[PDB]
Design a protein around this ligand. Structure first.
Ligand code: CLA
Ligand code: CLA
Ligand code: CLA
Ligand code: CLA
Ligand code: CLA
Ligand code: CLA
Ligand SMILES: CCCCCCCCCCCCCCCC(=O)OC[C@H](COP(=O)(O)OC[C@@H](O)CO)OC(=O)CCCCCCCCCCCCCCC
Ligand SMILES: CC(=O)O[C@H]1CC(C)(C)C(=C=C/C(C)=C/C=C/C(C)=C/C=C/C=C(C)/C=C/C=C(\C)C(=O)C[C@@]23O[C@]2(C)C[C@@H](O)CC3(C)C)[C@](C)(O)C1
Ligand SMILES: CC(=O)O[C@H]1CC(C)(C)C(=C=C/C(C)=C/C=C/C(C)=C/C=C/C=C(C)/C=C/C=C(\C)C(=O)C[C@@]23O[C@]2(C)C[C@@H](O)CC3(C)C)[C@](C)(O)C1
Ligand SMILES: CC(=O)O[C@H]1CC(C)(C)C(=C=C/C(C)=C/C=C/C(C)=C/C=C/C=C(C)/C=C/C=C(\C)C(=O)C[C@@]23O[C@]2(C)C[C@@H](O)CC3(C)C)[C@](C)(O)C1
Ligand code: KC2
Lengths: 180, 175, 47, 193, 194
């Protein structure tokens, strides 16, 4: 006889995230009720950032076994010994590129209040849309939900790939094809 | 059923359905049957003409079939099954690939599908691209379609007779 | 790996051990996880 | 759905609902939809399996080369029972994944069968209406549209016949498997199967 | 879709816009203009690339030397496979070739003020860069219908060319892709620019 059950876990009360306007809110999946504690916009900003990183990582991890950047030294088909073998001053430059992007995108807005101090500033809307898909507002909801779901699936997929490589010692495709 | 072509005065000028297969057919099922009949008939006509041309002497292709393997059209064998076996497997594969891409184009390029409200067994992609027979009347075109169906069915019988002569030579007369 | 269903049977019949004499209470008490000195030590998580 | 409306009543059990154990009286009419969907699915899979098993027992097989080195006769040498185990794992996975696509597309259709749709009516075109996916519009059931010539009463009678033959096929396929596993349990089976 | 007035409908797929995945609907008219400009750029680069690949396979080369300093003759470079030719071009030569290309691209985006991602798009329109496209006025003899036909032929030929260039580049590297048994040249399928 729950008054406002969660749409995902119907034997629990509705979390605050369920009654919100961010995308993907209806599922209402929050058994631990972390939306009540954590700021909801700040967590969509983190969710989207993590999903974007992971959905760049998972294709990268899965295809670096198959393909090599032509002539690159220290290449290994599996990502872990690949990062072990690759020269440190390439990983350093990658990290510097990421840090430069993060700093310049989040200039003067790095804290839960300073970020989203501006009411316009939306969760995860950093303004990166060169091709301007966002001008078409009919499919904006579809694209937002698809980005969210794909990012989440990519987080889980990259975690699975990395831990399966830890288990087996072999790259993702080799480990998969040695099951069947 | 009677609206469709193929019926002629030979079989009593009525539909030849001894097993009653047309009675369980929707309009579309009839379209599928007609398209299959047309394709089978023309394939059989091409096959029987090629087989007769090869087996009955006459001109043959002049050059080589493969420089790397050095197989001449003369050395293929000049008989159906053994010549087809002696053709290189790559040649067979690309012949079948050409036919496959042709049929995929036939299915996905003609917009009114013969099953979904189109003419059965028409190939606007490939039929007289320069217009050898385009200005003729509709009545002559229809009776020529009837001729196509008739002698194409006779060609079905001919090509199956050739196959049954190859595999069971004591069956057919002659050959 | 033996994927049950595709490269292996879905369910293998279990070993029928046949009906026979009973065991002894001491026999299955000096191997229990709670009433045996070594059974207690074999009940600690390996990890 | 409601145990009544459904058509499966026949003369073999008298013209009444055959529920000896009252399974239908202890359900909320939501599960009767699931039972007629599952009954028809079972019957259809069972008759396909029955004709396939009879074909295997008779020994008829395709001309050859199921795989690269394996032949159809060789992989069906030890009757139909061991044929599945003998088939290549890759082709087995392709059969399983095409069936997965079919049975996922059938479930994804909006009216469903439990939530107010016809239990048994698999969607004729499972793979259409899916954004980002393309299939060549070959409808799953009755691709050639044999059913266009049938009127409402004729197809009702044929649905009755479908249910009867599917039930009989369920009995038959279980008879085949049980007869193999337990010799002499089904006396009408020879050494072929 | 948004791709009806655009001038790319073929006669091979039928007179319906072949967008099976509906990428034209997803995005703005500016996005679709970007897609058209990218398609025409890929088309043009692929035509030029297939002609260059045919030239490299044939072996015809300029009479002269690439650099008077480095011992790199065109005769010397012609003996390598088509992509190792570019790999063997001097670094400074590659740098200034890319400099010219980048200057052209920047000026195409700059001086053509009504932008392709803007009102009055003109997506593939690079005329406006004076004396760049058709300096000799060859198309000047053509009327509107002939121009439309030539544009459609451009898109068709370039689409086929960008299929063909990838085909020849991958056919030897992964054997069995193209059913033909012609022994394509060896070498990479992808070269880093420097
Ligand atoms: C989380 C992201 C991520 C990270 C951390 C790495 C890290 C690494 N990759 Mg990379 N990689 C990624 C994604 C990633 N990759 C993706 C998505 C692909 C495409 C399948 C590749 C393909 C790839 C290959 C083929 C190779 C590496 C290799 C490497 C290593 C050396 C760096 C290098 O050469 O990069 C090369 C980077 C690329 C080829 C492209 C990266 C794509 C970026 C991340 C996309 C972002 C830009 C965006 C799409 C553009 C927006 C356009 C807009 C303005 C219009 C290093 C461990 C090398 C290796 O195996 O070393 C052991 C190597 O040979 N990666
Ligand atoms: C991805 C791996 C995989 C694959 C391809 C298959 C495939 C198969 N299994 Mg399964 N099986 C698997 C993993 C797999 N299994 C695992 C991990 C277990 C251990 C729990 C089993 C245990 C098992 C048993 C006990 C049996 C099979 C059987 C079967 C067959 C019937 C499947 C069926 O009715 O689906 C129906 C599908 C569903 C009910 C949906 C389940 C949930 C989805 C997948 C999510 C089929 C060949 C049967 C067999 O032997 O047939 C000859 C059989 O009796 N399997
Ligand atoms: C690195 C791999 C990868 C990539 C790049 C993508 C990319 C995408 N996925 Mg995701 N996805 C992946 C892995 C990946 N996925 C995996 C492993 C799964 C689990 C099965 C999913 C399951 C999944 C679902 C269920 C859905 C997506 C969707 C999407 C799209 C997001 C919405 C959009 O803009 O569509 C706009 C549409 C397009 C850009 C064109 C259609 C996509 C074409 C066909 C992709 C090429 C497919 C390729 C030929 C292989 C076919 C087999 C996008 C194209 C959503 C979508 O809309 O898909 C259409 C969607 O519904 N994905
Ligand atoms: C019409 C076909 C048919 C025939 C002629 C037989 C014949 C036989 N079966 Mg059966 N069997 C059949 C179909 C058939 N089966 C099917 C379809 C299956 C698959 C489920 C089986 C599964 C099966 C098994 C598993 C076994 C048999 C066995 C037998 C033998 C003895 C059965 C017995 O004592 O019945 C006695 C019948 C009656 C007393 C009359 C039945 C009516 C009463 C009133 C019903 C009572 C209901 C109860 C209270 C609930 C006999 C050779 C046994 C055998 O000897 O195996 C080697 C055995 O173990 N059969
Ligand atoms: C990268 C090159 C490229 C680009 C940018 C485009 C762009 C376009 N094509 Mg396409 N096209 C191409 C190559 C390309 N084409 C090729 C090689 C062929 C096959 C020969 C075609 C055949 C074709 C036809 C027949 C038609 C179009 C049309 C279109 C337009 C509308 C569809 C759309 O939104 O596509 C957007 C597409 C993209 C943004 C490209 C992304 C592709 C994915 C991500 C990767 C594909 C991988 C590949 C399969 C390997 C659009 C301007 C239609 C048109 O002009 O209507 C007026 C039309 O009718 N194209
Ligand atoms: C020398 C520097 C230079 C500069 C400044 C540009 C500038 C441009 N090029 Mg590029 N281009 C270059 C060299 C250069 N190009 C060369 C040498 C070639 C010949 C092979 C091309 C061939 C080329 C094509 C075929 C296309 C571009 C496109 C673009 C645009 C940017 C695309 C992007 O962000 O990709 C980021 C993502 C990548 C994967 C890279 C822009 C007008 C695109 C454009 O204008 O689309 C409308 C486009 O389609 N260029
Ligand atoms: C282990 C197997 C158990 C499932 C595990 C998860 C994987 C499958 C999930 C796909 C969900 C993806 C998902 O989002 O689907 C859910 C989505 C929801 O349906 P829609 O509302 O899109 O469709 C209903 C109407 O809208 C259509 O007009 O379904 C489809 O789009 C239609 C079904 C197509 C189903 C055919 C594809 C089947 C999957 C591919 C088979 C291969 C799997 C890879 C092995 C090679
Ligand atoms: C007593 C007796 O007989 O025993 C027989 C019985 C038995 C056993 C059955 C035997 C056999 C086999 C037989 C009889 C086989 C026969 C096969 C047969 C009769 C095969 C025709 C093919 C026709 C073709 C290819 C036509 C193409 C036509 C083309 C290329 C056209 O486009 C036609 C057309 O351009 C025109 C000309 C003019 C235009 O206005 C119209 C168009 C554009 C459409 C045996 C072994 O022989 C012995
Ligand atoms: C005697 C004794 O002691 O024991 C017996 C008992 C025991 C052991 C049980 C036995 C067994 C096995 C049994 C009973 C097996 C039964 C098997 C069964 C009952 C198998 C059905 C298949 C149906 C199919 C494939 C339907 C296809 C249907 C198709 C392709 C269609 O759609 C047809 C149709 O489209 C047309 C052409 C057009 C329209 O006009 C109508 C429609 C649209 C419908 C034995 C061996 O008998 C021995
Ligand atoms: C089936 C199989 O397995 O393999 C098959 C298929 C497969 C794999 C695809 C293959 C391939 C490759 C293919 C087909 C490659 C195709 C390449 C292609 C289609 C390349 C076009 C270049 C055009 C250019 C440079 C034009 C410039 C033209 C310019 C700059 C003009 O000025 C034109 C002009 O009109 C103006 C504008 C004004 C007029 O006043 C004057 C003229 C007329 C001059 C195979 C292996 O070959 C065969
Ligand atoms: C209608 C069907 C058909 C088409 C549309 C078609 C088109 C093209 C095209 C155009 C895009 C090219 C470029 C091309 C090239 C080659 N074809 Mg091919 N071909 C077709 C049929 C056959 C058959 C039957 C054979 C064959 C062969 C070869 C050889 C091998 C030469 C050698 O090995 O010396 C080469 C180089 C022979 C073969 O593979 O022999 C092992 C062989 O028997 N083709 N073929």
């Amino acid at each position: 006889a729950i008054a406002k059950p969660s749409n995902a876990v119907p034997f629990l009360t509705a979390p605050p995230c369920q009654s919100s306007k961010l995308a993907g809110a209806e599922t209402g999946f929050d058994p631990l009720y972390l939306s009540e504690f954590i700021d909801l916009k700040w967590a969509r900003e983190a969710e989207l950032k993590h999903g974007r990183i992971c959905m760049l990582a998972a294709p990268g991890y899965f295809f670096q076994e198959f393909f090599q950047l032509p002539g690159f030294p220290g290449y290994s088909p599996n990502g872990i010994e690949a990062v072990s073998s690759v020269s440190p001053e390439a990983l350093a430059q990658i990290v510097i590129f990421m840090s430069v992007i993060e700093y310049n995108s989040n200039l003067n807005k790095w804290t839960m209040d300073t970020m989203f101090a501006d009411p316009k500033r939306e969760p995860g809307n950093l303004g990166f849309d060169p091709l301007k898909f966002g001008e078409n507002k009919n499919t904006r909801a579809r694209l937002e939900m698809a980005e969210l779901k794909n990012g989440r699936l990519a987080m889980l997929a990259f975690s699975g790939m990395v831990h399966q490589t830890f288990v087996t010692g072999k790259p993702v495709w080799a480990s998969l094809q040695d099951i069947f | 059923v009677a609206d469709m072509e193929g019926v002629g005065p030979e079989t009593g000028n009525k539909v030849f359905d001894p097993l009653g297969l047309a009675k369980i057919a929707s309009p579309e099922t009839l379209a599928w049957y007609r398209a299959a009949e047309l394709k089978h008939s023309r394939v059989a006509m091409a096959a029987v003409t090629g087989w007769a041309w090869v087996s009955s002497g006459g001109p043959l292709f002049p050059g080589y079939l493969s420089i790397d393997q050095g197989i001449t059209f003369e050395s293929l064998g000049r008989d159906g099954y053994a010549a087809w076996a002696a053709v290189p497997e790559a040649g067979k594969f690309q012949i079948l690939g050409t036919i496959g891409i042709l049929e995929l184009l036939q299915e996905g390029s003609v917009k009114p599908h013969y099953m979904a409200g189109g003419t059965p067994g028409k190939v606007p992609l490939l039929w007289d691209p320069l217009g050898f027979t385009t200005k003729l009347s509709a009545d002559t075109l229809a009776t020529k379609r009837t001729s196509e169906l008739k002698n194409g069915r006779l060609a079905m019988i001919g090509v199956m007779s050739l196959v049954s002569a190859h595999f069971i030579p004591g069956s057919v007369p002659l050959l | 790996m033996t994927i049950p269903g595709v490269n292996a049977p879905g369910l293998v019949p279990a070993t029928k051990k046949s009906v026979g004499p009973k065991p002894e209470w001491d026999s299955f008490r000096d191997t229990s996880h709670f009433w045996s000195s070594e059974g207690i030590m074999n009940s600690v998580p390996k990890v | 759905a409601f145990v009544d409306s459904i058509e499966g009543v026949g003369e073999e059990t008298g013209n009444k609902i055959w529920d000896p154990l009252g399974i239908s009286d202890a359900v909320s009419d939501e599960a009767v939809m699931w039972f007629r969907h599952s009954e028809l699915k079972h019957g259809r899979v069972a008759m396909l399996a029955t004709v396939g098993y009879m074909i295997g027992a008779a020994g008829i097989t395709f001309p050859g080369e199921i795989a690269k080195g394996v032949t159809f006769a060789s992989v069906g040498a030890s009757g139909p029972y061991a044929a599945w185990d003998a088939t290549p794992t890759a082709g087995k996975l392709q059969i399983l994944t095409i069936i997965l696509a079919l049975e996922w597309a059938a479930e994804t259709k909006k009216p469903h069968y439990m939530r107010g749709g016809v239990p048994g009516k698999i969607d004729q075109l499972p793979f259409e209406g899916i954004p980002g996916l393309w299939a060549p519009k070959i409808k799953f059931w009755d691709p050639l549209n044999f059913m266009g010539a049938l009127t409402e009463e004729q197809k009702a009678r044929k649905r009755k016949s479908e249910l009867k033959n599917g039930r009989l096929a369920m009995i038959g396929i279980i008879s085949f498997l049980t007869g193999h596993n337990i010799p002499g349990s089904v006396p009408a089976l020879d050494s072929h199967f | 879709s948004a791709a009806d007035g655009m001038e790319g409908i073929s006669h091979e797929t039928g007179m319906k816009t072949w967008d099976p995945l509906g990428l034209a609907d997803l995005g703005s008219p500016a996005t679709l203009a970007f897609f058209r400009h990218a398609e025409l750029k890929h088309c043009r680069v692929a035509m030029a690339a297939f002609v260059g690949w045919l030239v490299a396979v044939s072996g015809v080369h300029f009479p002269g030397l690439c650099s008077f300093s480095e011992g790199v003759s065109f005769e010397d470079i012609s003996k390598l496979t088509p992509l190792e030719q570019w790999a063997a071009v001097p670094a400074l030569g590659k740098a200034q070739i890319l400099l010219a290309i980048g200057i052209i691209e920047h000026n195409s985006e700059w001086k053509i003020k009504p932008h392709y991602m803007a009102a009055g798009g003109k997506p593939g329109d690079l005329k406006g860069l004076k004396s760049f496209w058709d300096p000799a006025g060859l198309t000047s003899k053509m009327s509107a219908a002939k121009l439309e036909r030539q544009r459609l032929s451009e898109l068709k030929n370039g689409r086929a060319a960008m299929i063909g260039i990838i085909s020849v580049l991958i056919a030897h590297n992964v054997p069995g892709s193209i059913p033909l048994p012609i022994n394509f040249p060896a070498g990479p399928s992808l070269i880093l620019p420097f």
